[PDB]
Amino acid sequence: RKQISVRGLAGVENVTELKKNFNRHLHFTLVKDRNVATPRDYYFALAHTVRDHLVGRWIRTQQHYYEKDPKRIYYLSLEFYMGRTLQNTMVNLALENACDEATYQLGLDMEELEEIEEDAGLGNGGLGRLAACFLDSMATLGLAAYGYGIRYEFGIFNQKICGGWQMEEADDWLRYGNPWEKARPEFTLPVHFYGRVEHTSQGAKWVDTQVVLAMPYDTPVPGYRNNVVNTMRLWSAKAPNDFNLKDFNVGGYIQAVLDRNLAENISRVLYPNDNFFEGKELRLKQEYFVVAATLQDIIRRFKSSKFGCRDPVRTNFDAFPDKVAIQLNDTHPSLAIPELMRVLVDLERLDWDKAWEVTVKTCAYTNHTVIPEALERWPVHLLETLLPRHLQIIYEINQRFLNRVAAAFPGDVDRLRRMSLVEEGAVKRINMAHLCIAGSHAVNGVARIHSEILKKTIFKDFYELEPHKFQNKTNGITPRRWLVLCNPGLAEIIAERIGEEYISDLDQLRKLLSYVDDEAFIRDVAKVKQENKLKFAAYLEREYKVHINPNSLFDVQVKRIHEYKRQLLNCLHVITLYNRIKKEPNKFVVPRTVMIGGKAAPGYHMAKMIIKLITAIGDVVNHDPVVGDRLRVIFLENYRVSLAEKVIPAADLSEQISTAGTEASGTGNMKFMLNGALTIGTMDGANVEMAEEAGEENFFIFGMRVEDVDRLDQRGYNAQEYYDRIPELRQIIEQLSSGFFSPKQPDLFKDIVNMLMHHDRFKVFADYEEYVKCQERVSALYKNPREWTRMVIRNIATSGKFSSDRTIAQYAREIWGVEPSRQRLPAP
């Protein structure tokens, strides 16, 4: 009753008040004292001091939307890669200063506690950091969004290099809790699995089903310094704990021991695809899961939150596409369409046609691949076993769509078998991308070139039938995470001259273009990067060692360690560089520290191998007494978002070298721009729009473009060919297989040899020379320490297109329909 209210509960900004709230939590929540507490307790102590402050806002923020009924847009994804949370909550919440002070007074080093937190083993690749860039921008722009994905116990693995080879341990990030989550067993929901469909008078029943319980953990995610805080809703699988007797099925036998290990084990570990080992009923089990749970919430909350009031069409969902917006990341939530159709046709009774009008006005799908054999597809043998009613709902969807197609092109019967959701073959499957296009009103590519590719090759019949459903939205980066916390200095001078305004529409960063020439800009920013690198060459010594140099050119590549990313390009050129500098030692050469981070994909052998070669490379060069301090090669173990927040600022040269048109977008790309790095790269994916902003002058675009790559396909790329012109290349395939870079196991990199000389799909030897040589244009510029630094501001001013802020206001305005407020919301 109203004495119970939010109006009082924290004094905020006093150190003071903060030190009392560290004093309560440490003693009363953690129930540890001053004498037996430990650093991990004291970070847990502080997390609660700030979370106090988050949920304050959260509650307000949330009840804001009950009485103000706004459109609620859900960002449905099965990977969400949030990383560290304490610093971020401080900047968005301003408390950082206070927080510091308070723990400095309380006699505790705040940074020493900040690396006691670990990343949310929750996501994994780029597409994760992507919904974690969008989450923060969504809130910021006043937008009512909840993000639903799964909560993973084990995230996805941890990388330890062992004797060269990638060794994977496991992330139980939650071990000792995670303070920012609030689990919720009151809102548990039963997800059905397997079953049987009886069609009777009023509808079909999907009877006899095993069930997995799904129950929700909420994390709040704040806006930037306007006091909105949003709901990340995570699911967790639970085997219904009804074992000794329930259904009086067991007496003699437990297979239930396995229900309670194959139900539960849905949210255990993340599998990320475009790999995995075999399209396991477990991945489809997770994708069905996340969607059944998530949709129940969506309807609980359309009918509830004053829509028992705002009814007015038998709670008919005509109000639904007006109020709800489901945003389908990749094909992985695609079951959201058949399921929304199940719920609606079966469970309420909205005749198929209304609830399909409703479905496509609610749904929208974001494409992330460039290549068509890699679009997800699932076999009718699996959807029939497992999700049978759904299979039926897909066949009868496709009935009708392919009629839509039959009215449209009488007699093109081959397009009728080019549009279908069932791809007849060796084995008959459903193409899950073609489902999304048919139940979403708006499909977008994720970068410029990339949607032109969806429109005129890949989805080109679809675009011909319904042109009006395709769009573009170039992915962004969030300036908070990727400017303010990951480089504080670099945001000080920017506001020191240009002055904050920008961190919520990054385009003002361009003003600092008009500020190039100043002879201080140029020596200051150099100091900053020269601040940052020292710090990294400490990391590269103290907690993971080597003998780096600060003074050096900082050659960074942190990608997925797949083939098509050319990590090997990088290695031919390092050994290039090491061979010359072995021939004429006494020779001035703008030297570098080469750094390659990534994880491989367990079981992808080539990628396991490449890392070994990149480490091995390292024992050899980095311990040779004639290279001295000239080349350095560092494999970056356990690359991840919080290692990314530090590697990106020491880095000079952002290597973005993937074979032309393989990458469909590119996000590491954008952070690498905003913190001042020079970006050598093919015209691919994202370096395209970066180049058309920063201007071609300022980049290191090179290599065989798409045109050329598709022409070396009509011509049969013969590799041994370059082998024979280039004496170096001869000489570096040479040393590898000879046994140079591995005298205890010479033969070893024979694999890679035979990949490169003979079966190289991605055309390494073809882009060699024009790359070796393009590098000599950057090794040009980093002798002349002034001009290097001149390029750099000119890259940096340009960057405000690479704002999640942007990427979001567009989604917001053009699909979601909602207009992105920048309003600071009230609140205690």
Added chain:
Amino acid sequence: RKQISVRGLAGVENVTELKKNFNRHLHFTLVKDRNVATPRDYYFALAHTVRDHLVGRWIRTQQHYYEKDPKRIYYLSLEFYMGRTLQNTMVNLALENACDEATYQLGLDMEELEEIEEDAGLGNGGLGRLAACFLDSMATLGLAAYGYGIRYEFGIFNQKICGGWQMEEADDWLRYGNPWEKARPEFTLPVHFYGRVEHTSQGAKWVDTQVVLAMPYDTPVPGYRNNVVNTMRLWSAKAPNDFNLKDFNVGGYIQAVLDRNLAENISRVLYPNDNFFEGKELRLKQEYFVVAATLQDIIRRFKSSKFGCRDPVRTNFDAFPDKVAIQLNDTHPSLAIPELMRVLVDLERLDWDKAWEVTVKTCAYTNHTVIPEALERWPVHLLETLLPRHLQIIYEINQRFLNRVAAAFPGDVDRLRRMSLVEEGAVKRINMAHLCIAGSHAVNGVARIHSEILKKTIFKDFYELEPHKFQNKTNGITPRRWLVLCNPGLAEIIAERIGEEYISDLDQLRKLLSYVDDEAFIRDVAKVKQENKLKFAAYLEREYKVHINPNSLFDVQVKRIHEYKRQLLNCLHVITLYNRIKKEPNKFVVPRTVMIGGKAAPGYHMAKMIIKLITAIGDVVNHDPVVGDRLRVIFLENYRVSLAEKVIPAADLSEQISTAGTEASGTGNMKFMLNGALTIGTMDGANVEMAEEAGEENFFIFGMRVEDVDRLDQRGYNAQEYYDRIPELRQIIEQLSSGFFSPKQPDLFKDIVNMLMHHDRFKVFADYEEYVKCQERVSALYKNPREWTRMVIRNIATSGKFSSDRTIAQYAREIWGVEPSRQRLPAP
């Protein structure tokens, strides 16, 4: 650091602050608001407002101990039937009136809230209540006592009577958590199973073990206003979790699903004793589990808290007993004795005889078996496989104990094969009770005749080698749960009169003796009890339903449903009574409400059947219009501590009707005296010492005493001889078998007629008459309200022998060697 302190985080006792905490927790902790909260969220919130008060003290107490270094007593038992914690945590802390005001003003009903808490499914009987009453009285006379047990996730069922038949639903008490516990990931231990004993040169080695990990959770136990709060540590079982790689034995097979199933379910479920269905390895596995984990937490705390300062003799376990006390409640924690031997001889490195002296001075057994064949015994085939290092030490201990018997009884070669701890027969068994007598420096029975017979019959040869070990300690009860909080009514008046002093020692209630004849008191006492019976009829007619006339005499029996608890005797006298009212209707008959309650024990049949007997019996008399409201029968469903707390204060007669020489003591008994009720009952165990305190003249002792049992046994028993003497026994036997209580199934109760007629081990019929004579004396009294109550007074003022505070101050001085202080520790 030092600014980081407890000192004054609570505004403590201000509605002004407490409301504001039921407001931080409902919002910041729970993370709900005024809008979205359920009752539960508020009982949850209140729970946390109290809990702060609670842990401040707990912190102060435990650091208090660190500084002073007193003897620590550790209480191992396998059950703690705590019951509810809110209202008991508030009276031991005084908060009831501040927490009421406070919730009342935010407009929340404090008692509604209290019915949200579920009883800890951690106990299951008279043995688990004993342990949590000693635990209250251990905090109250300030003893540094930890309690140690298993933290069962699912209790041991909730009885729910479906169709007359008991149906057992799981009790996941923790379903929505439990707020009082703070789990400790930090100090998780291994519990090594199976494996192999290697004999190296310095000693044994237990190798190749399978390992479960025991992880602690602690609850706090507030003392009554003396400001101490001690620890209670429950061990949750936890399978090691690196399932996808370890030892690189997987890839191929998971039978390891069963580790994480059979390690995990060591804590899901209780297995309660002298029964069960078959002496399973799980039983014994729970048992070794709580010990292995605990003697590590016990030697940890011993090595840590100031013992190399307190070393003196190489921290020697010479000085271990000054600082440790180990209470093996029943044989279940017996393995405590080869394990403390195992660690000190194998791990540490004393010799046997040194570890032996230190073992027997540290453990003390307590016994609850009045009779012999229930006495715990494990098969050595069953200990070899699982516990091989420990089998060896029990063989060496048996060997060495026997040498002492021969030294003492030269040539008594049959005493040797009695005093042995290894039994031979059908299968070779180890008798775990003789194993406790050899590792305890004391053995104690829990009643005078109980503790007498342990000495004269049960363990007689042992008594003869070792007088200084056997002793008696009669069970007691706390006046806090069981007077102050179950019935505050009778608690006010006893202080307007003799005034609070008494709660900290019950003997002052004798001061009320002189008040037999004040006529205020006498009608106050009675008004008090009526106010309870009336309260109690509100439950019976509300949250369950019937027509219990509030004014009638309340007959209650709430013991375990068993053959030897005679709830049959009771039903025969009830259907008798039925018959007589029906017989001679318009008569004066002194009317009753017979309420019988108890949980059967699944896989026992006479017990499951008797429950249907009392439910049907009722269903008749409880609708028969010629009876009106002269009789009711009610089966109290799902008997637990918070139904006890409700029935004991309302009850008028307690039924303690055992067959003489079957009970050892009985704590319920005692709870019935203090709540101002009368007692018909046979002269068993506790009733002996209960009666000599109040004088025989105020109990209703009826029936065969022990001596008379042995007489009907030597001379030979024959129920049809009683049957032939008593025409009223034909009267209901007839009635039972004819089908008068079983409309759809006559012959159904033939199992009981038949048994009663030829297989009543307990002589129901032999006690039929003195019982139904003694009960005609009982109804007498209820017609004379003045004297009924004068009987009530010489009972309430005489209870003093029966406080757990008595029991415990004796345990402390004769066995444990600590002097119970009553000093208030000052604390916030």
Added chain:
Amino acid sequence: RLWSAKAPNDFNLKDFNVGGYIQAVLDRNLAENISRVLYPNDNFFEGKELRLKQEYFVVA
């Protein structure tokens, strides 16, 4: 002379091990299918324990 695998058939008690779990079903199916199936070489799907299990068996 050709060989067929056969697990020891004492399956309810023998080793004084069971009355508890039967995992033990699996020797009588992972010994049993040592001779129930060719696993033909320079292929197969993964150098399973079962083929090494079979080479030793015909040899021993």
